[PDB]
């Protein structure tokens, strides 16, 4: 522990909305300090979303207005894409960083495959 709960795969409707779940059970004395979502481009994961001390940051204009990440429930950092495009198909990674009771940082990530169905 901690580990992220993320499905092996998610299928969403073309031009519709999709949720990529990413949750974890909050740990006593673990402080969430960073959330990232990444999209896989070959051997390189590419950050498309960052939540840090200054709030939320979408790093590509293609996503602004259609990428949102859950925030109301502690431990739920699921990603929602609206108006799903064919070429949103990819492996996506959810990544969370915490400060620990012993003063260190621990990171966990987990991969899902997003499929878009016509």
């Amino acid at each position, epitope marked *: *522990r901690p*580990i992220l709960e*993320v499905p*092996e795969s998610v299928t969403g409707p073309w031009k519709g909305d999709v949720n990529l779940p990413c949750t974890y059970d909050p740990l006593q004395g673990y402080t969430q300090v960073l959330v990232k979502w*990444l999209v*896989q481009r*070959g*051997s390189d*994961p590419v950050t498309i979303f960052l939540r840090d001390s200054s709030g939320d940051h979408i790093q590509q204009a293609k996503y602004q207005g259609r990428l949102h990440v859950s925030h109301k429930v502690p431990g739920d950092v699921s990603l929602q894409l609206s108006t799903l495009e064919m070429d949103d198909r990819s*492996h996506y*990674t959810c*990544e969370v960083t915490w400060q620990t009771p012993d003063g260190n940082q621990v*990171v*966990r*990530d*987990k*991969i*899902t*495959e997003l499929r878009v169905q016509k």
Partner: nanobody
Amino acid sequence: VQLVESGGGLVQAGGSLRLSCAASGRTFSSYGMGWFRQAPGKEREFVAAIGPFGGHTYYADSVKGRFTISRDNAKNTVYLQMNSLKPEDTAVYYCAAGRWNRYGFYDQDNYDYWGQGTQVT
């Protein structure tokens, strides 16, 4: 899904074994792959891991330099080259698959599929 290890057995000190784990039932090129060990009594310890999407290698300090993880994605298999076998390495070694990408590869909890293990002495 099955993960099947092989290549262990009996050897004395300073020798070299080679472990292999054939993975059956997914395209495991998108899974991180890892090797763990459990000596009797001793709790299961992390040995080595290799990330999905080509990706990096990671090793325990106790086995580092001596051991080497590799993967053949066509064969859907992962390997562990073990040189200079100290007798404390006497354990069953298990291969495991998980959907981590670059972090948490040392955490047993991060792995969804486990092999039976190959006994090494």
